[PDB]
Design a protein around this ligand. Structure first.
Ligand SMILES: NC[C@H](O)c1ccc(O)c(O)c1
Ligand SMILES: NC[C@H](O)c1ccc(O)c(O)c1
Length: 547
């Protein structure tokens, strides 16, 4: 039992709503293995060292996302940026959980609505492969687009309309559950691991097995394992892989630091990082395999090429998995089980992110920490309002805008600044010394290189590419107006610009000379007395030339 609980916790650390929802459609969008290659490369190189470093920071410093930067005061802005990114991701994750809850509620029937046309939400163009000899006219696609989102009542992001009442109710229920599971403390979140630890793996395994034995799975798998290098030479796949890695691992949102703040001082962070990375890789590959097999079956069914079977945007899982479920025996049971699993994963992810935000904003201000209930209610209410903003008829457009812009370049810049700060300024040698004090062994040379040189360089390259090589936002066959792209870049800057603003604020807040001000702002807050002694490591070339 003791071993089982430990393994379950370790695996649950890894599996997320991202790995189940976001990875499928991202892998579909960039072809397939052309995405896995850069996905695994970035996973190792950036994700593993960064995951380990965030865990180590959170475990050693015993502070939230924002306050942990007492080691280097200037990067409290980076802390606030990651908090804001967590806020936005919370908005649209809650919206997606509302989708899943509605879909589960609708799944409680003997005749699943995603089996054939002929319902009140069915357009005259609906085509049923069974009732008769594009992708917007398939049964499940029609249901998802019309009977849930009601997208047929919006012309674009400029005519979003008014909130859908069913999704509004479901989002309200999800938000209420979140608040009631977050209003007491971190303890109540530790008893939900079991449901999210076994159901996702069982569902992935059963879906893999069933999909492999499908009429059209062979072509899907062949396309999945076929790699296009001309796509690898475009940097869009690289951008997507990097953002997906930092979304699936949880790094860069302040979740890891906030979680590790409550971990024991003798926990083994390196082992956790290794196991989580391996599990993430295996689960992502299995999800890609199953998804491509299922959509190859769909292509063989609808008589369309694999390149246009389903939408490339958010909701590919909600359009695809029901199709596979309809082919199973006793499809109602599998549908309810799978959507319960999705609900559990989404609730766990939202709980983690909201707890990260709450801890980060509470460790900074003691008065907020003394009123956790009211603070949780306020944050949850703001999240509910801004998610309601995304429940409108054309809510998919706002959701896509947020998904593309809240994360991505913003998270890449935040993680790059975290790495540069920690390693270069705080001393990689000092960080390894803290690791040794905590766990009992200094990290290997590979970890030190990854933290100091390899990861910051790759992240800088990705950020520069993302800024220069940027394409206008689109959703399938709809092209967003330019002002939508302007608003997206404004959202990205709203969290990317918190670093220089805080840097200058701290510079103009402290008193003293220019050199004294820089020393005061670089030195850890608990070693400020050394500033008057003119003994600063950062002003000696040896500190910079330490590997
Ligand atoms: N945008 C890529 C497109 O959806 C696609 C998916 C899978 C493929 O095998 C392919 O050739 C193209
Ligand atoms: N992978 C999801 C990530 O852990 C996350 C960050 C911020 C959030 O508000 C959230 O719901 C999830």
């Amino acid at each position: 039992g003791k071993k089982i609980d430990f393994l379950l916790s370790v695996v649950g650390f890894a599996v997320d709503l991202a790995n189940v929802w976001r990875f499928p459609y991202l892998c579909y969008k960039n072809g397939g293995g052309a995405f896995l290659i850069p996905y695994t490369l970035f996973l190792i190189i950036a994700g593993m060292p960064l995951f380990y470093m965030e865990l180590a920071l959170g475990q050693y410093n015993r502070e939230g996302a924002a306050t942990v930067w007492k080691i280097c005061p200037f990067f409290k802005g980076v802390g606030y940026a990651v908090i804001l990114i967590a806020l936005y991701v919370g908005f649209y994750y809650n919206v997606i959980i509302a989708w899943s809850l509605y879909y589960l509620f609708s799944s409680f029937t003997l005749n699943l609505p995603w089996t054939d046309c002929g319902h009140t939400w069915n357009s005259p163009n609906c085509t049923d492969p069974k009732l008769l000899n594009k992708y917007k006219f398939t049964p499940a696609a029609e249901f998802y687009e019309r009977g849930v989102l009601h997208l047929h009542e919006s012309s674009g992001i400029h005519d979003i309309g008014l909130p859908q009442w069913q999704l509004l109710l479901c989002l309200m229920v999800v938000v209420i559950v979140l608040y009631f599971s977050l209003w007491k403390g971190v303890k109540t979140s530790g008893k939900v691991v079991w449901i999210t630890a076994t159901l996702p793996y069982f569902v992935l395994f059963v879906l893999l097995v069933h999909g492999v034995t499908l009429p059209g799975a062979s072509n899907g798998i062949n396309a999945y394992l076929h790699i296009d290098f001309y796509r690898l030479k475009e940097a869009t796949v690289w951008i997507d892989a990097a953002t997906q890695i930092f979304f699936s691992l949880g790094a860069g949102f302040g979740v890891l630091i906030a979680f590790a703040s409550y971990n024991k001082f003798d926990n083994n962070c390196y082992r956790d990082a290794l196991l989580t990375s391996s599990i993430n890789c295996i689960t992502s590959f299995v999800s890609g395999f199953a998804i491509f097999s299922i959509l190859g079956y769909m292509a063989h069914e609808h008589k369309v090429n694999i390149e246009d079977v389903a939408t490339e945007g958010a909701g590919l899982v909600f359009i695809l998995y029901p199709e596979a479920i309809s082919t199973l025996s006793g499809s109602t049971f599998w549908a309810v089980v799978f959507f319960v699993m999705l609900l559990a994963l989404g609730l766990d992810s939202s709980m983690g992110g909201m707890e990260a935000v709450i801890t980060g904003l509470a460790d900074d201000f003691q008065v907020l920490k003394r009123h956790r209930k009211l603070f949780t209610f306020g944050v949850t209410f703001s999240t509910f309002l801004l998610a309601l903003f995304c429940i409108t008829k054309g809510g998919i457009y706002v959701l896509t805008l947020l998904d593309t812009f809240a994360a991505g370049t913003s998270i890449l810049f935040a993680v790059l600044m975290e790495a540069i700060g920690v390693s270069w300024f705080y001393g990689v040698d000092r960080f390894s010394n803290d690791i040794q004090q905590m766990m009992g062994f200094r990290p290997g040379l590979y970890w030190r290189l990854c933290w100091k040189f390899v990861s910051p360089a790759f992240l800088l390259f990705v950020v520069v590419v993302s800024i220069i090589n940027f394409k206008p936002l689109t959703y399938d066959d709809y092209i967003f107006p330019p002002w939508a792209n302007w608003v997206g870049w404004g959202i990205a800057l709203s969290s990317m610009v918190l670093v220089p603003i805080y840097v200058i604020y701290k510079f103009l807040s402290t008193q003293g000379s220019l050199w004294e001000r820089l020393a005061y702002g670089i030195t850890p807050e608990n070693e400020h007395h050394l500033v008057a002694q003119r003994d600063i490591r950062q002003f000696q070339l040896q500190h910079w030339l330490a590997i």
